[PDB]
Every structure is written in C-alpha cells, then in structure tokens.
Amino acid sequence: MNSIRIDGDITLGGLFPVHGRGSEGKPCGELKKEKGIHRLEAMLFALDRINNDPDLLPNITLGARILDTCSRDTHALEQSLTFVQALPERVVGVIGASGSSVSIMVANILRLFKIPQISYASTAPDLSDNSRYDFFSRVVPSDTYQAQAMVDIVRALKWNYVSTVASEGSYGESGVEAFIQKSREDGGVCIAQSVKIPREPKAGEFDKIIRRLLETSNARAVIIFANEDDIRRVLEAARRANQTGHFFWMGSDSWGSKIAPVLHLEEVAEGAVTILPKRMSVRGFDRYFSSRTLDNNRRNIWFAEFWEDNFHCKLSVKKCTNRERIGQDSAYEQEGKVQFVIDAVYAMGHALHAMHRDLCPGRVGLCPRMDPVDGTQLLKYIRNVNFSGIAGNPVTFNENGDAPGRYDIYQYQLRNDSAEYKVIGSWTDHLHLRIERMHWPGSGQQLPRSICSLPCQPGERKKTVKGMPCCWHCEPCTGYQYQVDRYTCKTCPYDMRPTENRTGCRPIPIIKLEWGSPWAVLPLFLAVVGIAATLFVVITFVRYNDTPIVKASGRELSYVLLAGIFLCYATTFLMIAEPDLGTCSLRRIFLGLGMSISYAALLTKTNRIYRIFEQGKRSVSAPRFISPASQLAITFSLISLQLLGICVWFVVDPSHSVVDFQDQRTLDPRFARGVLKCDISDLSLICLLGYSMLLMVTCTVYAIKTRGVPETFNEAKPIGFTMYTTCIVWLAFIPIFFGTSQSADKLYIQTTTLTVSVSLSASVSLGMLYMPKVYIILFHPEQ
C-alpha cells in the first residue's frame, strides 16, 4: 500500500528516498523533502509532460509505479521486487534508485530480468562496469570526468611537475587514479609525487604532507581529491609551514566553491582552482511545484508528510491551517538534481518512443511485441538516445551508461580581501578558460608554473630523467663537440674547432715557416752566406781553371764537388718555403742529392788516394781508375744509383702540398693550430741517408788510415775531418729529428734541422777542403 500508482499502458518504475533511514528496526525516518519528495515530484512532473507531449508515445499513457527507498538497501530492494512480482502493472523500465549505495541493488535486481535502469543521482564508477551492471545507465556524469578536466587544466596552465594529494576512500582514490592514468594518457604532465590523506590522519600528518610535497619543492601545484576538512587541514599545514604563496591548489567538487574549507586560510587558498558540477534549475518545475497544496497533489501519498515537515505544522508543533503555500509560508528552492530526474524520465520516454516507431510503427497503444516490450531492446534504445535535455544540454550515454562531463571552473580569489570564488570558465568535455583573469598570490596576474627543470643554453644538453619524460638533467657539452640535438652534441673530426656556442664547428688556423721567425731566419741566412762563401771559393777555381794549383787538386773531382756544394745551397732555403710544386719537386731529393754527390765525390777522391793500399787485398796492379775521365766515371757511378732511388721514391711519394692539423693538435681545438708543409714522409730519410751515410762510413774507413799514407796525400786530412764532422752532424740529427718526435715542436725542429744540415755538409766541405787552399790559389795560382 505505501507507493504511488499512476495508471497507464506502459508502466514506468521509479524510486526516491522519500524518507531517510528510521532506527531501532524501523526502515523509514524523516521525510527527505528535497532529495526525496522534491525529486519524486519532478519525476511525476516530467511524467505528466511526457503523457501531454505530442511527440512521445502518442495517445499511449506512461503510467508509473513509484517507490520509497528510505535510504536503505534492504528496504529499497524488497519493494523493488514488486515490479517483477507484477511479471498487475507492466513495469517496463525504471528510473532512479537515487544515490549509488541503493542504485547498486536496483541495478542488481533489474538486470536479472533484462529490465533497464536510468539513475538521476548515482555517480560512482563502480556502476560503469558492464560485466556486473550491463542494464545500468545514468544521466549524470561519473566522478572520473573531473579527472579529465583536471588533466586538461594542468596542461592549460602549462604545468608538468605536479603532486597529487587525496583522501583514502573511493572518492579520493577514484579521482586520483583517473587523474594519473588520464594524465599519463594525454601526456605533457608528469607527477612529482602521489600522497594520501588517511581516513584517520594523525596529528601533524598534514605538516608531514607538506614536508613531503616540499621534497619535490618545485612541484608547486597540488591536486586535491579530499573532503572539506582534509582540504582545510592541508591549507592549515601550509599556513603553519609558511608555504603561503608557494603552493597552489587545484581540486574537486568536494571543495567546490564553498568558503567553508578556506576560512581563516583565505591567503593560503587564494589562487586555488576548483571543479564544480554544472547545473541549472528547472523553472517549469518550480512554477508547478510551488503551486501544489494538499488538494493539488493527492496522488502523492507522502505529500501530507511533506506538508507537516515543510511548514512545521500538524495535519491531525502548531495545528496546520491547510492553507500554507511553499515558497511563501516556508522557504523553497529547487534541488539541482531535479534537472536529472527530469532528464532520466525523458531519456526513458525517448527510448520507449524508439521501440514504438520500430516495433509498433505509427499505432496507438501496444502491439503484440510490446506485450513483453523486451527490456533487452529498451536497453539499447536508452543508450542510443540523443536529445536536448531539460537544461537544453544534450542527453547521451556512453557505452557504460555514463553521461558526458559538465562542470564549471572557478578560482578562489581575494577581492579587496573578500573570500570569493570566481568563474574562470567552464568545461564541457573541453576547456574554455579565461586564464588571463586568474590570480596567484605569488604572482598576481602572472602564471606561475609547476615544472620539472629549466631549459639548457645552446651547447648544453637536456638529458631525460629516467621515468619522467617532462624532466631533464642539464649537462653542458665539452671537448671538441658541437650540438646535434637538444640532449645530444658530437665531435668534429678535426681540423675544425667548435664555435663559441658549441652548436657548430669552424676551421683551425694554419702556420707556414715565415722568414721572420727563428726557424726560418737561421737557414735563410745560412743559405745566403752559403752561396756567397761558395762563390768566393768557386770563383778562384774557375778563373784559375788551368793553373798548377787547381790541376793538382784533382780539378775534375773538385769541379763536381764544388758544383754540388753550390747547387745544394742555391735551393736550400726553398725546402721550408710555402709548399708548392716548385719545392715538392725538390723535397729532400735535390738537396739530399747534392749532399750525396759531395760525399760520393769525396769518396772518389778518397779512393784515388787510398785505393793503392786497399786494392792490395784483391790485386797488386796500379790503382784502377786513374785517368781523370775514369775518376769521373766513378764519381758518376756512385751517384747515378741515388738518382734511380730518387726516381722510384718520387713515384712512391707524390709531389704535393699538405695541411696536417696533427702537428699542432690540441684536446681543446680553440687552442689548436695546424701546419702547412710539403707532404713528405720520414721514409725519404732512408732513401737518402741509407746510402750517403755509407759513403761516409767508407770514407772514414779510409781516413783513419792516414797515419800510414805519404805526405803528397795530405789533402786527405780535411776530407777525413769533413766526413767525421758531417758524421757528427748526422749523428746529432737523429736525436733531433726522431728524438723529438714526442713533441709538437717537431713541426719546425725537423724542417729546420734538415735545411740546416744541407748547409752544414756543404759548408764544412768548403771550410776544411777548399778554403785553406783558396787563399793561396787566389794570390799564388802556381802553388
């Protein structure tokens, strides 16, 4: 008997907590005016409209059987069965079951018979699970839509390093898990940390929460899914911790726009951003509802109780006049969920209007298919509704029966100190925010950002922090490297040095041997003195070519020797000149060649003297090769082989100029130089000295024998000293050329010692063998 029946062809089921819980075994308490009877009447309000509406179920009466949950799952459930005991009225499909704790039981029972449910009030995600509540639907969004809005906002504020804070319990945990996973899925935001507030927090835990939030202190953003007191206590902790202006808060509808959680914490909460459910009142309902007196709603069997509590009066505390009107004789306002009670009723109405056009097309009353009116079909027709709801706001369901997310976005601001929440914008599965109208205590109108780290300068690398793509370690680039990518730089093989920003490389300066330097001036001078000294000598031998003193010297050999001395000097300074073919055609070849010829000709003269004694090991005849022509033939044989070694080496090591950065190489190229030289290998010294040093050894084998040789051969004395002397020069050479190879300085030492050695072999022969006689030749040609 305790229920409302509206007669009709199609009977709608419905449920409201018209009472709260009773006690001591009684199921039903006080009347929930607003959550109960206000919603209940909104159901009948929409029901009357449906029956009156020419577009839905034409001339078919949507009756209803409506029920009172008393906010108890067992009482709500035991009366809900009556729809199935009637499988009495055909209860085709059902509205409501109010909040979640009751909606799980009505969702449990009605799916057992493939009967659909449309809740106007239950929000919990635990009903989005089609494996258990396949027949469930709601016309209100779940809590997880705030999480998407939160992710969207954190991105809108360009934050990427945030902390998430929430209470224990499904509200907090749901918001957090939806937030974290949606944040991960959208990207752009990394979470510095995730912290919970216990169902029973310990004293000081909130200060500990702040300290933990400060372990990642640049994570100035805090996301909250916690209740009013938890919010208040976090803010108190920030106050106590003096983090006012450091932390900025974001949070759920549990904060909403209530001033309650921020009282005496106004300065702490300022700038906080909260997500509020979007709703409007239905004006049509208030106009209707506010006109209902006892006699205008007698079909509602609980209306009398509503009157007794509404007006604080008794109908059988003051005796009631039975004339009081709500909104005049008692305050009245509409419950926001009235909006969804009406949309739930209409969504059923629309789905029934889909079974009508398909299974009973254009009829009045119910076709045979509509005698069962299979709720397995009504279920698809509900999920597929798409219509403007009572608020004008489209009513749809996703595949789990969830309505799209509709929220307002507010920021807590202090306007002349006033504790107000201002609208920044809104979210309708997408943001619309006037960010420029936002305020933050640590910045005023400027947007603070909760971020990982700071950008690197060109030439510095942003190395990803493992596990957090948003974050980086800034690692400067070094050595001879240049930037490649934001987190990469690489080396330039080189003869090129990095530029100042290390984002590119440029060329290393090259040196040649310039005639002002110590290593160019010494041999430049020596080559010039060489020729002047040489011509003093040559000139006396040429002008007195036919006199007794020149002839006595072995004029023919003296000519080859003197010519080779001159010729090597003539080009000595060129071997260190800026490299080109006019020098790379000479290399150590030409100078080496005159030196080698000088030694061979000294050897030929030496053999002319000492052959009479050495020949004795093989023959007892007159020294072979005595005629001057034959002495020249030896002079020539000894050297023509050098020309052949030269010809081969020329092909092996080509006549070209090279820049070798290696000779002045550094680890830091900004201090590096390179060197311009003719491209000549060390093997060229074997090609030369491998034989000229043997002419020497041969000469010294003979020179040491002077002790037993007749005085007309005293000309040997200076050949001997010359060769000993130049041996010493070449013994001095190897420790300088090779003994210095470990040092960069070889670039001038090697080239200098070589050009100088040429002048020395040449100068020593003149100084010992010719000049002591030139004085005499010049003034006494007959001696």
Partner 1 sequence: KKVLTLEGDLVLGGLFPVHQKGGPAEDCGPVNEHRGIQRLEAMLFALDRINRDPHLLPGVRLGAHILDSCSKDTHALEQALDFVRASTAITGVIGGSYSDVSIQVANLLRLFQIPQISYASTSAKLSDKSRYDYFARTVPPDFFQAKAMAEILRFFNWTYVSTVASEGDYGETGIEAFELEARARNICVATSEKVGRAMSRAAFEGVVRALLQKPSARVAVLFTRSEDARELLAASQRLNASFTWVASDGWGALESVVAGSEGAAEGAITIELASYPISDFASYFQSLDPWNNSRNPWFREFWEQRFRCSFRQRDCAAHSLRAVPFEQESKIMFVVNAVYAMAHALHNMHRALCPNTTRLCDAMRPVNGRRLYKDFVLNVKFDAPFRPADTHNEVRFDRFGDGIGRYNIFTYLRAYRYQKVGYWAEGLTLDTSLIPWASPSAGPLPASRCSEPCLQNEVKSVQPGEVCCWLCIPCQPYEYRLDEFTCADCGLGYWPNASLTGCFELPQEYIRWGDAWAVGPVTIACLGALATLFVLGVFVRHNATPVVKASGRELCYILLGGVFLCYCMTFIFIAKPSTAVCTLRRLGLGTAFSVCYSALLTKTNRIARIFFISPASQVAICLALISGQLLIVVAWLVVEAPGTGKETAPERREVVTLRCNHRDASMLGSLAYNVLLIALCTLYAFKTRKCPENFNEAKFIGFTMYTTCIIWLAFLPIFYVTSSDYRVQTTTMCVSVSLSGSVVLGCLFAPKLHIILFQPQK
Binding site for partner 1 (CB under 8 A): 77-78, 81, 84-85, 87, 105, 108-109, 112-113, 131-132
CA distances from 51 to 11, 47, 62, 655 (A): 12, 6, 6, 109
Please tell me the distance from the alpha carbon of residue 228 to that of residue 252, in angstroms, as a whole number: 10
* 494 contacts 505 by C-beta, under 8 angstroms: yes
Ramachandran sector of residue 59 (left: φ over 0; alpha: ψ -120 to 50; beta: rest): left
Q: Name which of 651 and 667 has its Cβ closer to partner 1.
A: 651
What is the smallest separation between the CB atom of 82 and partner 1, expressed in angstroms? Answer: 10
Calculate the alpha carbon distances from 473 to 361, 456, 483, 760, 773 in Å: 69, 9, 16, 63, 83
121 belongs to an annotated ligand binding site: yes
Nearest distance, CB of residue 106 and partner 1, angstroms: 9
Binding residue per annotation — 192? no
Beta carbon of residue 190, minimum distance to partner 1 (angstroms, whole number)? 34
**Which tokens in the block code for residue 608?**
């002319």
CA angle 372, 374, 378 (to 5 degrees): 135
Q: Nearer to partner 1 by C-beta: 109 or 162?
A: 109
**What ranges in 585-658 are assigned the alpha helix state H?**
589-614, 628-652
- Cβ atoms 751, 576 nearer than 8 A: yes
Q: For the chain, what percentages of helix, strand and coil (3-state, to nearest 5) are there?
A: 45, 20, 35
Answer whether 158's CB lies under 8 Å from 447's CB: yes
Query: Is 98 labelled as part of a ligand binding site?
Result: no
Minimum distance, C-beta of residue 66 to partner 1, in the bound complex (Å): 20
Query: How many CB atoms are closer than 10 A to CB 15?
Result: 28
Which backbone phi and psi does 131 adopt, to 5 degrees?
-80, -15
Q: Which residues of 152-278 form beta strands (DSSP E)?
A: 161-167, 190-197, 221-225, 248-251, 273-277
Q: 171 a known binding residue? A: yes
3-state secondary structure 101-122: HHHHHHHHHHHHHCCCEEECCC
Q: Which is nearer to partner 1, 69 or 664 (CB)?
A: 69
Give residues with Cβ within 8 angstroms of 381, minimum separation 6.
350, 351, 352, 354, 355
Minimal distance, residue 112 CB to partner 1, in Å = 5
Which has the closest alpha carbon to 477: 236, 722, 668? 668
Q: Cβ of residue 251: shortest distance to partner 1, in angstroms? A: 32
* Closer residue to partner 1 (CB): 113 or 775: 113
> 231, 261 in Cβ contact below 8 A?
yes
As a whole number of angstroms, the distance between CA 565 and CA 554 comes to: 16
For the chain, the first-to-last Cα distance in angstroms comes to: 164
Rounded least distance, CB 687 to partner 1, Å: 17
Nearer to partner 1, 31 or 92 (CB): 92
Q: Whose Cβ is closer to partner 1: residue 79's or residue 227's?
A: 79
- Give least dist CB 85 to partner 1, A: 7
Measured CA to CA, the distance from residue 277 to residue 404 in angstroms comes to 12
CB of 546 to partner 1, least distance (A): 37
Query: CB 87 → partner 1: shortest distance, Å?
Result: 7
CB of residue 610 to partner 1, shortest distance in Å: 21
Nearer to partner 1, 77 or 510 (CB): 77
- Cα–Cα distances in angstroms (integers) from residue 243 to residues 135, 248, 449, in the given order: 49, 9, 16
Q: Using the minimum distance from each CB to partner 1, give the nearer residue, 101 or 517.
A: 101
- The label of the residue with tokens 């009406």 reads 342
Residue 111 or 773 with smaller CB distance to partner 1:
111
Q: How far apart are CA 452 and CA 472, in angstroms?
A: 7
With tokens 């010992």, the residue in question is 768
Question: Which residue number, 77 or 423, has a Cβ lying nearer to partner 1?
Answer: 77
Say how far apart CA 167 and CA 209 lie, in whole Å.
12
Nearer to partner 1, 113 or 671 (CB): 113
Q: How far apart are CA 463 and CA 474, in angstroms?
A: 6
Taking the C-alpha atoms of residue 678 and residue 583, their distance in angstroms, rounded to an integer, is: 8
Is 337 assigned a ligand-binding role in the annotation? yes
* Rounded least distance, CB 105 to partner 1, Å: 7
Least distance to partner 1 from the beta carbon of 129, Å?
11
For residue 611 the two structure tokens come to 């052959």
* Concatenated DSSP letters of 67-98: EE-TT-HHHHHHHHTHHHH-----EEEEE---
Best CA proximity match to 781, nearest among 555, 532, 602, 530? 555
Q: Judged by CB, which is closer to partner 1: 129, or 475? A: 129
Largest Cα separation within the chain, whole Å, is: 172
How far is it, in rounded angstroms, from Cα 768 to Cα 485? 70
Query: What would the 3-class secondary structure string for 386-414 be?
Result: CEECCCCCEECCCCCCCCCCCEEEEEEEE
Compute the least distance from the CB of residue 114 to partner 1, in Å.
10
Nearer to partner 1, 85 or 742 (CB): 85
Decide if 349 contacts 8 (C-beta within 8 A).
Answer: no
Nearer to partner 1, 2 or 386 (CB): 2
Rounded to the nearest whole angstrom, what is the least distance from the CB of residue 652 to partner 1 in the complex?
Answer: 10
Nearer CB in complex with partner 1: 529/641: 641
Q: Confirm whether residue 381 is marked as ligand binding.
A: no
Rounded CA-CA distance 103/98 in Å is: 6
Residues annotated within a binding site? 100, 121-123, 171, 253, 337
Residues annotated within a binding site for L-glutamate? 100, 121-123, 171, 253, 337
